[PDB]
Design an enzyme around this catalytic site. Structure first.
Site, PDB file in Angstrom:
ATOM      1  N   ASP A 212       0.911  -1.112  -0.080  1.00 51.91           N
ATOM      2  CA  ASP A 212       0.224  -0.049   0.118  1.00 51.91           C
ATOM      3  C   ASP A 212       0.852   1.200  -0.271  1.00 51.91           C
ATOM      4  O   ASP A 212       2.149   1.124   0.228  1.00 51.91           O
ATOM      5  CB  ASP A 212      -0.839   0.014   1.427  1.00 51.91           C
ATOM      6  CG  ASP A 212       0.043  -0.074   2.630  1.00 51.91           C
ATOM      7  OD1 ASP A 212       0.359   0.997   2.982  1.00 51.91           O
ATOM      8  OD2 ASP A 212       0.198  -1.274   3.045  1.00 51.91           O
ATOM      9  N   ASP A 214       0.488   3.684   2.289  1.00 45.99           N
ATOM     10  CA  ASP A 214      -0.056   4.125   3.851  1.00 45.99           C
ATOM     11  C   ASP A 214      -1.153   5.186   3.449  1.00 45.99           C
ATOM     12  O   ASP A 214      -2.208   4.856   3.063  1.00 45.99           O
ATOM     13  CB  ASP A 214       1.312   4.762   4.133  1.00 45.99           C
ATOM     14  CG  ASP A 214       1.140   4.838   5.798  1.00 45.99           C
ATOM     15  OD1 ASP A 214       0.783   3.987   6.465  1.00 45.99           O
ATOM     16  OD2 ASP A 214       1.431   5.924   6.364  1.00 45.99           O
TER      17      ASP A 214
HETATM   18  C1  MTM Z   1      -2.453  -6.538   7.988  1.00 43.04           C
HETATM   19  S1  MTM Z   1      -1.662  -5.115   7.638  1.00 43.04           S
HETATM   20  C2  MTM Z   1      -0.570  -4.743   9.208  1.00 43.04           C
HETATM   21  C3  MTM Z   1       0.717  -5.906   9.139  1.00 43.04           C
HETATM   22  N1  MTM Z   1       1.349  -5.640   7.908  1.00 43.04           N
HETATM   23  C4  MTM Z   1       2.610  -4.606   7.801  1.00 43.04           C
HETATM   24  C5  MTM Z   1       2.095  -3.222   7.035  1.00 43.04           C
HETATM   25  C6  MTM Z   1       1.509  -3.003   5.867  1.00 43.04           C
HETATM   26  N2  MTM Z   1       1.214  -2.013   5.303  1.00 43.04           N
HETATM   27  C7  MTM Z   1       1.652  -1.162   6.440  1.00 43.04           C
HETATM   28  C8  MTM Z   1       2.169  -1.986   7.658  1.00 43.04           C
HETATM   29  N3  MTM Z   1       2.562  -1.500   8.645  1.00 43.04           N
HETATM   30  C9  MTM Z   1       2.424  -0.061   8.964  1.00 43.04           C
HETATM   31  N4  MTM Z   1       2.047   0.753   7.791  1.00 43.04           N
HETATM   32  C10 MTM Z   1       1.625   0.175   6.663  1.00 43.04           C
HETATM   33  N5  MTM Z   1       1.348   0.935   5.745  1.00 43.04           N
HETATM   34  C11 MTM Z   1       2.706  -4.525   9.376  1.00 43.04           C
HETATM   35  O1  MTM Z   1       4.236  -5.016   9.724  1.00 43.04           O
HETATM   36  C12 MTM Z   1       1.787  -5.433   9.927  1.00 43.04           C
HETATM   37  O2  MTM Z   1       2.343  -6.730  10.609  1.00 43.04           O
END
Ligand code: MTM
Ligand code: MTM
Ligand code: MTM
EC number: 2.4.2.28
Lengths: 270, 270, 270
Positions: A212, A214
């Site tokens: 993603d 964020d």
């Molecule tokens: C199910 S999404 C949350 C997990 N994936 C990771 C993650 C994906 N995308 C993001 C994560 N963590 C923080 N911000 C982000 N935008 C993190 O390490 C969590 O274990």
């Protein structure tokens, strides 16, 4: 002889990657690992797979027993640890689906033990101040980068991962702030996993998968993350399967020796 | 039907704001709330007042039971939560006495549980990764902003609140640093209150009252803060009294529905 | 009458500095101090020496009982506390061996109690919000600066110390980040030592000794730090021996009175 520990992250911990699998539950002086160790091989290389959040993803980042996980892998004889981790992209050029072979981190966690030397275990006595200038194993990262290229995968050769405590995602103000600090990707699990691996004298490298952007236009959500992983998980699997045999065919005596010394001499004995 | 929970901060938790008051002590799976819930009404709208630091201000920010407070309000049936909070101004244009309807936050707390999903309560199972792109309820903030205008009050339509652990105030180096990070105001209580409210699917908004200029020429002190609050508390009271009836006369079905879904789908079940 | 408490850091806690020494183990409401208090004198000034990490350096920064250490010194009657601390330099002009009389700090610690007012001890009731605009005693710092000059020592008249949790050293991304935040030196012990001293109404000052350049060309390591300290420890010893008699010959009634009031009025009683 090398033995590769593999820690699988969100939707990136498929046991089918190894052949001749055998489940093995273990205990450590720091408690039980996230789940049973999965012993197996990729070609002729011995591996040990471990699901970071448990095979059913029941452990939040803040409560993952990083100490037990790294300890169990070291105890099993792992010389290397390659992990996968879903992360948010903080840079326009890092698109979801892209792989980032991170080389630095920025700690934003607040409630996590980051050392084996907490004076509570005879197996680790004294005060240890481990160097973190180069947190990830350069040699392994180099092979991962070259292998991704051979596979034609969109892959970034460097990147700074900011690890937040979680489980909540970041606010927009924090997201924009991390960008100014120099962070390129964001997750909740790199720290202290990479730190403890260092203290254990293990060559650690991380395959970060952007899932993603964020929230710095569709903001991040769990569904969006799981969807991207579902569509791109195969890439990380192929990278691991192709990289590991190459690691098992190269020289590591000097590399592992240096990590051993750095870890050893970082300890202050009474 | 709506029910407005009101969490009162330092010198901004006057129970006289509600009519037909009834004290109600409750318990939650996370412990007891800061103090008894004060059930009452503003015009024809049901409200539930709670003093964040206890009616006698005996609980430091670090030890406020944010989980219990939000849980108790949700359990009582609150659909909305509007709070007041004293804060330091990190911007010249935000003068003490001014109201800031904050829309973002920067977390600097380190020892606070920020989720209900800690795997210790059957009522909240799984791992929850709640989105924080828009931490505060935009609709409620809009009414607060328009109401402040109708009241002729100096009010800022946006603002980033940095929440420090405390109880100590910030050093000058930290104060100047927060300014570079984009923070506009500073306090010790917004996080994780806003985070837990989000997980509970509650529309949360905050009436921030600047009480000092922190230390970035008279530096902040407890006496200076209490004095400013004493002189300006009436503003927050008038704002709440005027805003709440307006909230009770508008549509929230779709708004509350969306928050419900976001919270629900943020949970990863086994 | 003044009494100078001296907290010695890594390789900078030599008891031979005091004459007429007497060992005294004590207890506090917050537990036992790092080690026994060493009562003694420098010329005609009463001093109390305490090794921050224990005389055998067995306590990591994260586990130093800062509350007990400051409490014990206050209880013994210390009016001043001058400490020594090894630190990494984040500025080219601050070379290893140089002394930095720090005047500000940036907190990066996450698991440390920073106040005596945690509502668990009758001796410290209420909520205390101590001001941190000027964390270090200016008068003592002035004497330290002038004394270093009289001794011909390379000494910096100001500096912002960023205190990390540790025990690990910082990554390069963090190192570069701290520089952008305005940090000049880096260690793992200034916070909350300086904070608790403030709450106790004690004039606190710190003699920071640069022992490395962290990693922002030889990166920092424990051996490099101990070597630099071995070569430069004598400087801090001479500075303390020369500064203390000067402190004992000046006026502090008004200075100590102001610190007493600031600490007292920072407490919110029920
Ligand atoms: C199910 S999404 C949350 C997990 N994936 C990771 C993650 C994906 N995308 C993001 C994560 N963590 C923080 N911000 C982000 N935008 C993190 O390490 C969590 O274990
Ligand atoms: C009695 S002042 C401390 C309280 N008031 C808020 C506050 C006012 N001004 C400032 C606060 N908190 C941090 N920095 C500031 N400059 C915090 O949230 C505490 O609960
Ligand atoms: C034995 S080196 C670690 C100790 N020395 C201080 C230190 C020296 N150099 C650095 C320290 N701490 C962090 N980063 C640095 N570059 C810290 O406060 C530890 O107590």
């Amino acid at each position: 002889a090398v033995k590769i520990g593999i820690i699988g992250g969100t939707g990136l911990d498929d046991p089918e990657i190894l052949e001749g699998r055998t489940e093995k539950y273990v205990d450590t002086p720091f408690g039980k690992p996230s789940d049973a160790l999965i012993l197996g091989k990729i070609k002729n290389v011995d591996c040990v797979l471990l699901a970071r959040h448990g095979r059913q993803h029941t452990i939040m980042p803040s409560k993952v027993n990083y100490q037990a996980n790294i300890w169990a892998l070291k105890e099993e004889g792992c010389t290397h640890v390659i992990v996968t981790t879903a992360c948010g992209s903080l840079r326009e050029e890092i698109q979801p689906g892209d792989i980032v072979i991170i080389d630095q981190f920025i700690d934003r966690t607040t409630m996590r033990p980051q050392s084996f030397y907490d004076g509570s275990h005879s197996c680790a006595r004294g005060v240890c101040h481990i160097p973190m200038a180069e947190p990830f194993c350069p040699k392994t990262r180099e092979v991962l980068i070259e292998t991704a290229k051979k596979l034609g995968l969109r892959c970034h050769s460097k990147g700074t991962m900011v690890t937040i405590e979680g489980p909540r995602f970041s606010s927009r103000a924090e997201s924009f702030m991390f960008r100014t600090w120099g962070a390129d990707v964001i997750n909740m699990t790199t720290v202290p996993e990479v730190v403890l691996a260092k203290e254990a004298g293990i060559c650690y490298a991380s395959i970060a998968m952007a899932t993603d952007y964020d929230c710095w236009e569709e903001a991040v959500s769990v569904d969006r993350v799981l969807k991207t992983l579902k569509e791109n998980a195969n890439k990380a699997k192929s990278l691991l399967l192709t990289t590991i045999p190459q690691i098992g065919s190269t020289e590591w005596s000097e590399t592992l020796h240096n990590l051993k010394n750095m870890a050893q001499f970082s300890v202050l004995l009474p």
